[PDB]
């Protein structure tokens, strides 16, 4: 699981309400969050499994 999988989901400064997934290191699973629509960081995925294939474990 790469380093950016541990960094909190960044909404960003734009004001859209779009639902994306980000890995949640405390649960060990990906959970949704609201992306504002610009300047996506890496822990920002468009399905639960893309998130887990990148940020998941064994």
Buried b (16+ CB within 10 A) or exposed e, 40-49: eeebbbeeee
Q: How was this structure determined?
A: X-ray
The Cα 12–Cα 7 span in angstroms is 14
CATH architecture of 1-58: Irregular (4.10)
Where do the structural domains in the chain lie, given as residue ranges? 1-58
The Cα 48–Cα 52 span in angstroms is 6
Q: Cβ atoms within 10 A of the Cβ of 18, count?
A: 13
- The CA R_g of the chain, rounded to the nearest whole Å, is 11
This structure's resolution (angstroms)? 2.2
């Amino acid at each position: 699981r790469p380093d950016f999988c541990l960094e909190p989901p960044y909404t960003g400064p734009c004001k859209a309400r779009i639902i994306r997934y980000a890995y949640n290191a405390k649960a060990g699973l990906c959970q949704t969050f609201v992306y504002g629509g610009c300047r996506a960081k890496r822990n920002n995925f468009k399905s639960a499994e893309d998130c887990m294939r990148t940020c998941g474990g064994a």
